[PDB]
Each structure stands twice: as C-alpha cells, then as structure tokens.
Design a protein around this nucleic acid. Structure first.
Lengths: 106, 48, 167, 111, 197, 127
RNA sequence: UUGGCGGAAAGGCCUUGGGUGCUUGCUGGCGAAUUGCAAUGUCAUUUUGCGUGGGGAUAAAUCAUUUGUAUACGACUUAGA
RNA sequence: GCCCUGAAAAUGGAUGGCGCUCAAGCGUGUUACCUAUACUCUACCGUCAGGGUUGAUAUGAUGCCCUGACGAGUAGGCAGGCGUGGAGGUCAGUGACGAAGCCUAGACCGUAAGGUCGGGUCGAACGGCCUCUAGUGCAGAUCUUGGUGGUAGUAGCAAAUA
RNA sequence: AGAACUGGCGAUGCGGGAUGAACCGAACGUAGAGUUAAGGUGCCGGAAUACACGCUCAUCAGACACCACAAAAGGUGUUAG
RNA sequence: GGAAUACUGCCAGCUGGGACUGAGGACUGCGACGUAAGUCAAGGAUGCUGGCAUAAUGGUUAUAUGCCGCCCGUCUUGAAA
RNA sequence: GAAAUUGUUGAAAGGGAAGGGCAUUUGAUCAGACAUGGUGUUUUGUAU
C-alpha cells in the first residue's frame, strides 16, 4: 500500500529536569495521539528506536539505531518517560522517534 | 518599492558604456552586444 | 625480584553453587490467543502480514501459517509478545498439527569455517505445507472476504490510535 | 509530629512489613516467631501476633513489648500529604498535630 | 503530523498565540503565521500605544545603534513576543526560530494552502464581551510602519481572486454532493451505513 | 583462563586531575586537595570537579584484577616465574621494563611451558 | 501538446488533444519459505568530483602608470593599445 | 473590598523576561501533576560495635567469617599509607644483547598520594622487600637565581641652516 | 550602638526565594529505583491555557513572607453590607 | 413502610499492564502441599533461544549539543570583589 | 638535553573571552575475550 508504518510517531522533548538541573539518564517522549495518562498506559513497556543516519558505513549500513523502552507516564498530558541503552544526544530534542507495538498485551 | 524589469535602448553611446568599465582601453567593449541582438526583431523581447 | 611475593595466594579451585529454588512452570498465554485466531505480525520478514495461529509449541512459541498459498507465510513459529491477536476467529478443527514440535524447526548450525563469501528447501517441509493448507484453504472460503483480508497487509494510516483501535 | 489513634489493620501491617526487634543493641528483622519468643518469651509473648496483641490491647508488658520494637522507618506517603503546606496544624489545613482517626490513612501510605 | 502549519493571525491574541507557537517550534514543528497585521491585543488602543512608547524610550545611551531595536512591522511585534518566549541565545533556541515565518497579509504559496486557527488564542473565545482591544496594524502604523496601504490593496486583490475559487469549489461540491446522494440507498451504500460509514 | 569473578565495576573511571591543572603549567595534574578557605572545589559547589573519597572504592572481590581477570605480577627472570607455577588461574606476569631482549625470550618460552599468561609478550621483539 | 490565468517572495494553478502504462469495479491460475522466534533491517534529499555523449558564448578585474572633484595609509575620482 | 486621585529625580530597564484582562491579576475551595544530596528498599566502599573460628592439610588467629548501625566540616588532634637523598641485610635482583634520565590526547592497577608496561631518544649504572636516618614533597612569600613572553616589528632612531 | 533565651552563618554543600552567608525545606560516602519537602505547573521551564465561586479595567493596574516602601485625606467607579 | 445508593472503614478477596534489582554460592533453618516417596513461589535467578565473535560492546581523546560552573592564596563577621 | 617561548607540517573548533562538571552523538585511536579440556582418533611426522 501507500503506507508501511508499523510504529507510532513520537517526539523527543527533553531530558528529565528541574528548573536548573537535568537528568540525561531519563528522557521525555511525546507520543502522537496520546493526550492523557490513561492513554499512555497502553504504551508502557513498548520499545522506542531512534533512527539516525551517519556517513560512515559500519557493518553494511549507514543507518544506526538507538534502542529504548517506555517506563512510566509523566504529567497530565500524555507525555511518557523513556530510558535508552545509551542516552539520546540532546541534539535530538524535537526529533522523531519510533514507538513500536511490541511487546504486545493484545 | 522593488524594480522588476529594465529595458534599454537599441544603441548605447560610447560614453555611457564607459560607465560600465574600469579599464576601458583594454577591452573588446562587450557591452549590450547580445542585448542589441534582442532588437532587429519586431516584438521578440522589447515590448514583451 | 621486581615484586617480592604475596604471602597468601588465593585458592584457585572453583566452588559449587547453592541449590537454586526456581522451578519452571508452563507459560500461561493471554486469552486473546486461541488456536485458529488470525494474528498480525509486528516483526520479521512478514511484519504487517495477517496470519492464522494454529498451535502453541513447547518453547513458548506459536505455530503459525499464512496460509502459504494466500500470503506466502510458511509454517513458522513466532513469539507470543511479537504478534497482535485480532478478533477474527476461524476454526482449525480438523487440521493435522500434532506432528510439528520444537525439534521440527532445526537450524542445523553451520561451522565457522564455512564463511559466506558471496552467497535449498527441504522436500518434507513443503509437503507438510500443502496438507495443512488444504484443510485450511477450503475452510477460509466459507466466510466472504477472508482470503482478501489474509492476503492483504496490515499497516497504520494517518490518524489511527492503537490505544483506541480494536484489533 | 503527627499522632493519631491506630486501628488493628495499621498496627498489623506495620509490624508485619516494617517489623524489627532490638536484640543486643542490633536491629534484627523479625521474619519468624522464634526470635520474638527468644527475647519477649519471658513475658508470655510467643508469636508476632502475640506481640501485636500487647500493642493494640495495652497489656501489663506494653513497655517491654514496645521497647523491643525498633523505631518504624517509614517512607513518604505514596499519594502525598494531601495538603499544600505541612507545618500547620491539621485543624488549620496543615499536617502536624492530632489527626484522631486520619493517622491510619497517613501511615498506610507511608508504610 | 503535518509538515508545515499555516496559521491565520486574524482575530488572535498576541501573547497567547506566541506561547502556543513557541512550544510548537521547540517541539520540532514548522509554523508559518499569515495576516500578522490584524492580530489583537487586550486593552484599549491608547494603553497599548503608551506601552510601546515606554518601550520605545529604552536605548543604549552611549550609542543608539546597539541598543534595543524597536521594530515597527506587525510581524516583528509578534516575533518579539515570541523570541522572548524562547531560549533564543542557545543553539537549540536558534534552530527553533528557523522553523518560524511571519508575514503581513497572505503572500504567495501560503495563499493556496489551508489556514488554521488556535481556539485557545482566539480573541472571540478568550476575551469577555465588552472588553476593548487593539489591532496590530493600527498600532504598528502609529509607531512608524509604512506599508499598511499597500498590504491592504494586496489583500483586497487576494480576496477577490480567492472569491471565484470558492465559487467554483462550491459549485463543484454541489455536483458531488448530489451524485453520491443518488448513488446512496444502494446495496453497497447500506453496507457502509451498517459499518458506520 | 581466569577464575570465575563478578563483573568489574569501578564507580568512577575519569582520572582525578588537580584543580587549575588546566589553567597553569606549574600546577601538575597529580591530585592535591584544596586546603584554601574560599575554594569552590573544597566547598563542593555544584558544577565543579569531584574530589577523591573512600566511597569510590572498588569491590573487594574484583579489586586489583586486570580486565583479563588475573592480578598482575612483576617478574625479572625465570626464577620469578615458577612463583606462579600453581596460580596460573589468578595471576599474570609482566616482564619488567629493564629486562634485556635476549632474556625476555627465555622467560616467554618458560611461561608457555607452564601456561602462565604474560601481559606484555611484545617488548623488544625483532621483525 | 493546445490555450490562458498568477509579480507580495509571481516559479505555481487550470485546461484541449492524442499516445502509453496501471486499475483492487468483479471473477480465476502460478510464485512467496531458509532473514531460521525480533534486531531502522537500509527504499527519502543536500552538496561536491571525475568520466561519459549532446547542445551554447568566446570576459574582465587588480597591480604597475596617470589625475586631483580625493586623501594620514588604505580608500575615492579620472585617463591610457 | 478591588480600582482611581493623593503619587516629583536624574544613562535605558525591570512582577526574573516575554507577556497576561470571565487573566497567565486578587480572595477562597478541591484535586492531578513536577522534583532535593531528604525519606523507603537494594548493591558497593570505609569506620565503629558485638560475636564465631587452634581441627587436620597449606603457609596472614595482626587471618578468615557472621551481624548491626553509622558517614557534613574551617581552626585543630589522632591514625593508616604514597613519594625522595643516604645506611645495615636480603633478592648468588636488572644492565653495553643497553642502567638512569627525558618525550609520548598508547595500555593496565589504586578512592588518592602513586605504581607498572609498550614505543622513541639515549649512553653506565640502577631497583623490589625488612629495617635505620634526614639538609625529605611547593603555586604563591612585591620569595632567591637563571631563562623566556604578550606588548611589538610597536614607542622611537626630529636640537646644533645642507 | 548595647543586652536576655533559642536557633543559625562563621565552619555548609544540596532543592526553593531570578540573583544574595544568615530566610524556607533539608544537612552531604559511591550508585539504582520509588515517594516527597519548600517551591511551583501559559512560554522561557519539568509539571492542569485544570475545576468551582466571586471581585477588578488602571491615559503611572496587579501579581505572594524575610524583600527591596508609600500615608493621612477623598471618589453617584463598582460590589456587598 | 420496605429498599437501594453515596460516604467512610475492613478483607491472612481475585487479577491484568509497567519499571529497577538477581547481592549470596555444597547441606543445615522456619514452613506449605501431600497417608508416602516427593514436590514447592519455603534462609537472595533460573530455563529456552538468536545475532556477533568483531572496534560490534567498551576505554581514551577531540568536537558538538542540553543544563550547570565567577580567580586561586590570605586577613576577615563577611571576597568574584 | 626538560619547561616556559618559537617555526613548519597534520587534525579540529571558533557570531563580544578561554578553560571545566554530568550525559550522549560524531570522528580518530586502542587494550582485553575470543580454542577449555573434550566424546574422540573420519589422523598425519604414529605416538603426534
């Protein structure tokens, strides 16, 4: 078909932070279509991939992936907390992530 | 205000086109030579 | 001597581990996974394909077939957490399935010496494919538009919210 | 502080989960009935529920039974304190003082 | 969800629209603002005119060319209210402001694209009836903006050209709205109706 | 070829460089404690360099172990090598820096005979 | 390919004709595996360079010299086949 | 009660800024949410305290092991260690097949003082361990001596007729 | 400038009060997870452009302790007595 | 006159989704299910599987980004001064 | 034959300082582990 997407679009908002200090080990992700903590309960435990591109091909691809998962909700407007194997570079604030539908409880 | 079109005359005198040169003496003088080729036609590019 | 000596060398013999108390109980699958249910594959070659769940194997995997004649998915096993169980239920009563087990899908691990420089199918695997399909294909035709539904591929369009959709 | 009148359920949950004894000036988790009988047995206390009986029904050996229990190390309430500012009297919209029966709702969230 | 969102500035409040747009850019969304000359600010015209003159009095004493610049165009009053809402001195903030374009009137290609509104920044929904307000074009032309007359002429030309487009669109929509009605109440049509569509 | 050990954790890998060792060429990177009265480093202000303290100490079980697993032992000749003839599983030998090129060959051959690992079997090798 | 419209930053919009390809509007036949139970599993656009084979046109500026409507030096303004 | 008059000071300017008008203001009430080195649980380091363990084989009973709590710090006190010159003993230690020294966004160990290794350069002596000894550890003292910069191709090299 | 009691700074980092030795919370070994304090939840900036009842229009509104000022006297401005 | 519901409180009532942790290392103890061998979620993680087996993970180093970070030593109640 | 200070070459960054802490991307560079043994002898130098 015209579309082949099997993930949910998301945006990397920022790290977990107070007013003056931030915590790079935990990031905030905005999932499209979610606007309340009840909706984000479905997405807890799902895997998040950040798919960026480099110029050096490493093992047969110029595309590199950063993996993570959704841990808990955040606030009142459907923002979630995520942790990755390696933290996102903070240059990707406002970049798109990929929230997958696995593992599935359906 | 922003100019959108400039149209020039068929023949430009040898003293007005010295305004467009810094070293006039060493040149082929190469000024409006192709623009004068826009003329010699009835309406090709002048009143368009 | 550059280094004099350590007075007491640690004993180099390994010690036994304690008696672990972790028994293994059979996995309890979620109620949405019933044999004959149509599933959606979320990962693999056939991600986005709709496929028919036949049997639950010993190693927690789900036996599944396309059928092959409909969408090309052969007899495989998949992980229960990597699929979505749809509500479209179809009967598999009368399908010979007990033959397939954990040892049926043997990879026959290759040696490291056989390095792939630049670049086949078992005869018994295709024959078991048509036997399973024949008992299934003639039964898919009963409900209209199921074959066109199975042959098609699933994907997410603009505006679908998986937390509100009913799969 | 914030003190109130505990019920049976909150005493039982405090002793069962956050229950430690003072043995030879050491904080020892109960986890069993033998150690309670080892120290408090001479007052007739044999089980973890016998000790709870001396607490809720103040017995002749309440002082000995209470001193055996190490101070209860509680967490913050799971749902918050329910007030914007703590250090006012509970009557005045704060937290401190005598909250008579509302201590159970507070301690159960901490425990 | 959408690559570039075009926002019609007409009838919006400067501060509430600025806060919404500032959060969109920082989240990676590209925003284009049109018709910035007819935004709205709460408070009567004189009060907001005095506030600009108070702002217009601040300049670096020893050299006026390095002091706070006072931009007079309506799209720059909106941009100032937005740049003060972003960490504009950082690399991330600078990238947020290259996702933003503000125009007086509706220029080319954005004139053939859908314009949206922000209901939480609209004056008719936020302000109480009977409360006074000021329009950005009037305020800007009082403090030195020079291009109100030309943009008004260009906007009037745009609306006339955008008038027969809708007239053609309205007529063609009628043809479709009648054909499918005839094509309705058919064996296929009932099945769609039973399935919500 | 190393005895089973838990995963090695450090809790700190960045070297403790002295304050202002980057600001002046007289101040060496060797760690010194700020004994001054207004030092932001000594007063532990946020955003400043962290000071060594006993909290960073390594786990006693994985302490002194090389990533290969063995504790490292300096040897000067063959006689220092049979000192490890029964502890090959928990000890690895370094040939010292001042051992001559010809004498390194004899040591390496004997370590292979006894199976003792040598962490630097490359010093002074002709090619 | 016919014909228009659009100058605010038009660089886009509409339309005549024929040709070609596809069509899931409907009904059929063949293939799909083995990536082994998942690994973005690679499908987009921005610039540059060398080869291609096919069109098109054959400049100045600076220094040096000179002038003083200019000038601390730069710069400026003149002139020189 | 809120608002307004009363209500005047010097560079341009401060509810932190933008901005906010059924507020993003004021009074009040109910919730949800954000996060400190704090509170709860766990792992690791060290200290303190209470204990177990002479039984053979294998050597630290100053050893090993179990348990509980605790950890801010100037002036200051005490303890355990790192490093340097020289001395007694030991390694029948290293070395012209290359000692020491020096350079090295190369590697390893230690919380740290520091120790080790590889490469380059080099040329004649030096080290580990147990003890002894002190002219024994530098960022400052308008410190001492020596060497070297920015300033900087800069100020300047214009009295006495040529 | 000088006393009394207590708590602090000196000698002390950490979260809040934009900023600050003393204020509020809370005192500190190295980390992980959870919950909070004081303070907040339009954007800067993590978190409700939440909910509910009212009041206020300022041609110098107001916006939160220490704290970074304003009074007596007045107003058919408006509200309630 | 007979009920329900709200509110509050209890259950040694059942159950789904998510995250962090796996310390210890032959046995000993307290228990549960069992007429009994025995089993167990009972004094701290095991089982099955895949890929790679290499700079892929990781270390170092330079840079970029988010947030934070005032110049050391001393006298001083108080020093970035 | 050290340092300060300097030249050439190479790499990198640079919108009114520079340097630093936490975390990660990118480039460059690099150590370790990488075959236990083994059932076994399809074996050669017949015991490898």
């Amino acid at each position: 078909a015209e579309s082949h997407r099997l993930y949910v679009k998301g945006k990397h908002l920022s790290y977990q932070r107070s007013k003056r200090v931030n915590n790079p080990n935990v990031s905030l992700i905005k999932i499209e279509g979610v606007a309340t903590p009840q909706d984000a309960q479905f997405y807890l435990g799902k895997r998040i991939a950040y798919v960026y591109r480099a110029s050096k091909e490493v093992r047969g691809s110029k595309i590199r992936v950063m993996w993570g998962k959704v841990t808990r909700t955040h606030g009142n407007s459907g923002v979630v907390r995520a942790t990755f194997r390696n933290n996102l570079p903070a240059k990707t604030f406002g970049a798109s992530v990929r929230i997958f539908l696995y593992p599935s409880n359906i | 205000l922003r100019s959108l079109t400039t149209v020039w005359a068929e023949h430009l005198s040898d003293e007005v086109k010295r305004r467009f040169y810094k070293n006039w003496y060493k040149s082929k003088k190469k000024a409006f030579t192709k623009y004068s080729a826009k003329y010699a036609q009835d309406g090709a590019g002048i009143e368009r | 001597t550059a280094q004099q000596a350590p007075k007491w060398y640690p004993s180099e013999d390994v010690a036994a581990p304690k008696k672990t108390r972790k028994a293994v109980r059979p996995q309890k699958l979620r109620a949405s996974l019933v044999p004959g249910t149509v599933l959606i594959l979320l990962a693999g070659r056939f991600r986005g394909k709709r496929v028919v769940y036949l049997k639950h194997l010993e190693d927690n995997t789900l036996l599944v077939t396309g059928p092959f004649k409909v969408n090309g998915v052969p007899l495989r096993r998949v992980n229960a957490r990597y699929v979505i169980a749809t509500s479209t239920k179809v009967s598999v009563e009368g399908v010979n399935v007990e033959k397939f087990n954990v040892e049926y899908f043997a990879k026959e691990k290759l040696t490291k010496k056989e390095k792939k420089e630049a670049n086949e199918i078992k005869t018994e695997r295709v024959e078991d494919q048509k036997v399973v399909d024949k008992a299934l294909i003639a039964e898919i035709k009963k409900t209209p538009l199921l074959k066109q539904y199975l042959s098609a591929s699933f994907s997410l369009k603009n505006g679908d919210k998986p937390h509100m959709l009913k799969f | 502080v914030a003190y109130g009148y505990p019920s049976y359920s909150t005493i039982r949950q405090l002793v069962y989960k956050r229950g430690f004894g003072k043995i030879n000036k050491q904080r020892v988790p109960l986890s069993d009935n033998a150690i309670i009988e080892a120290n408090l047995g001479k007052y007739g206390i044999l089980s973890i529920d016998d000790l709870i009986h001396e607490i809720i029904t103040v017995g002749p050996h309440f002082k000995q039974a209470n001193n055996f229990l190490w101070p209860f190390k509680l967490s913050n309430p799971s749902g918050g304190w329910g007030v914007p500012r703590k250090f006012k009297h509970f009557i005045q919209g704060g937290s401190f003082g005598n909250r008579e029966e509302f201590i159970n709702k507070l301690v159960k969230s901490m425990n | 969800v959408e690559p570039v969102v075009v926002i019609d500035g007409k009838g919006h409040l400067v501060g509430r629209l600025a806060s919404v747009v500032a959060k969109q850019l920082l989240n990676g969304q590209k925003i284009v603002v049109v018709r910035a000359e007819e935004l709205n600010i709460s408070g009567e015209f004189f009060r907001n005119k005095l506030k600009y003159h108070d702002f217009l009095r601040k300049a670096t004493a020893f050299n006026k060319t390095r002091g706070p610049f006072h931009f007079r165009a309506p799209s720059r009053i909106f941009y100032k209210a937005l740049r003060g809402m972003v960490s504009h001195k950082t690399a991330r903030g600078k990238a947020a402001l290259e996702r933003l374009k503000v125009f007086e009137g509706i220029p080319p290609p954005y004139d053939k694209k859908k314009r949206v509104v922000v209901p939480q920044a609209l004056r008719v929904l936020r302000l109480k009836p009977g409360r006074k307000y000021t329009t950005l074009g009037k305020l800007s032309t009082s403090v030195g903006w020079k291009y109100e007359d030309v943009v008004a002429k260009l906007e009037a030309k745009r609306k006339v050209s955008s008038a027969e487009y809708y007239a053609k669109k309205r007529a063609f929509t009628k043809k479709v709205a009648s054909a499918n009605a005839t094509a309705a109440e058919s064996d296929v049509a009932k099945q769609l109706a039973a399935l919500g569509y | 070829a190393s005895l089973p050990h838990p995963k090695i954790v450090k809790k700190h890998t960045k070297k403790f460089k002295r304050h202002h060792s980057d600001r002046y060429h007289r101040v060496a990177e060797n760690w010194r404690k700020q004994k001054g009265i207004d030092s932001v480093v000594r007063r532990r202000f946020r955003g400043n360099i962290s000071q060594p303290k006993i909290g960073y100490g390594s786990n006693k079980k994985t302490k002194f172990l090389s990533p290969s697993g063995h504790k490292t032992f300096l040897v000067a000749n063959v006689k220092d090598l049979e000192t490890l003839t029964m502890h090959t599983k928990t000890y690895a030998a370094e040939i010292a820096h001042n051992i001559s090129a010809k004498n390194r060959v004899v040591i390496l051959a004997r370590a292979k005979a006894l199976g003792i690992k040598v962490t630097n079997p490359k010093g002074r090798l002709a090619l």
